[PDB]
């Protein structure tokens, strides 16, 4: 049963009725061999192979 | 032939040294010294 | 003799730092840098005009410079070119991160 105004489906970047634009990840703040010089980040491969940050992009070409 | 330093190095001090080394040894030697100090700094940090 | 400098010496030769040191020696004999750049450019052109097909992986500018150093007594390879002794096989590329 649903009452008027209640949620039925969720859109992209939304989970359970709230805005969700990113992910939660384990992080440490420390210097590492210069890879982080200035403002650069070093990341693990888990993010690549477990698909935490993958996105779909669609383009249109017309004539 | 270099001085032995027993006190801390801060940014002002490194500029003075790079300057002093450029005058005594020249730009070529100084470039190698610089790459080596970089490695040591990154490793310790 | 400092005891453990072997790797640094291998690298200086391999990296191409040798060329940098050489350019500096040679400019210690000259009042105008701009003229020396012009002299080297001319020699390179003569070399390529005379034997065109040698060059392409061997560069003429490098040849002129190696020839100067060898004339003055420091052994340098021709065109500062070094082979990779340990390459796995044909069609294999080193990852110089």
Swiss-Prot record, chain A:
This is DNA-directed RNA polymerase subunit beta. It is found in: Plastid, Chloroplast. DNA-dependent RNA polymerase catalyzes the transcription of DNA into RNA using the four ribonucleoside triphosphates as substrates. Belongs to the RNA polymerase beta chain family. It comes from the Eukaryota. The chain holds residues 631 to 693 of 1070 of the full protein. Disulfide bonds: none annotated. In plastids the minimal PEP RNA polymerase catalytic core is composed of four subunits: alpha, beta, beta', and beta''. When a (nuclear-encoded) sigma factor is associated with the core the holoenzyme is formed, which can initiate transcription.
Swiss-Prot record, chain B:
Transmembrane segments: none annotated. It is found in: Plastid, Chloroplast. It comes from the Eukaryota. In plastids the minimal PEP RNA polymerase catalytic core is composed of four subunits: alpha, beta, beta', and beta''. When a (nuclear-encoded) sigma factor is associated with the core the holoenzyme is formed, which can initiate transcription. DNA-dependent RNA polymerase catalyzes the transcription of DNA into RNA using the four ribonucleoside triphosphates as substrates. Belongs to the RNA polymerase beta' chain family. RpoC2 subfamily. This is DNA-directed RNA polymerase subunit beta''.
């Amino acid at each position: 049963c649903i009452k008027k105004g209640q949620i039925l489906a969720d859109g992209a970047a939304t989970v359970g009725g709230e805005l969700a634009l990113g992910k939660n990840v384990l992080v440490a703040y420390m210097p590492w061999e210069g890879y982080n010089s200035e403002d650069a980040v070093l990341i693990s491969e888990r993010l690549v192979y477990e698909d935490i940050y993958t996105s779909f992009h669609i383009r249109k070409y017309e004539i | 032939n270099l001085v032995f330093h027993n006190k801390a190095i801060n940014g002002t001090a490194m500029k003075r040294l790079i300057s002093r080394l450029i005058d005594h040894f020249g730009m070529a030697y100084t470039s190698h010294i610089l790459d080596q100090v970089k490695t040591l700094g990154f490793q310790q940090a | 003799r400092i005891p453990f400098l072997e790797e640094q010496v291998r690298k200086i030769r391999d990296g191409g730092k040798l060329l940098t040191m050489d350019i500096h020696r040679l400019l210690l004999n000259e009042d105008n840098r701009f003229d020396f750049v012009n002299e080297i450019a001319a020699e390179a052109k003569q070399y390529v005009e005379n034997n065109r097909d040698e060059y392409g992986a061997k560069k003429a500018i490098l040849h002129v410079l190696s020839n100067r150093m060898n004339d003055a007594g420091v052994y340098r390879a021709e065109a500062y070119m070094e082979s990779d002794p340990f390459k796995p096989g044909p069609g294999y590329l080193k990852d110089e991160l």
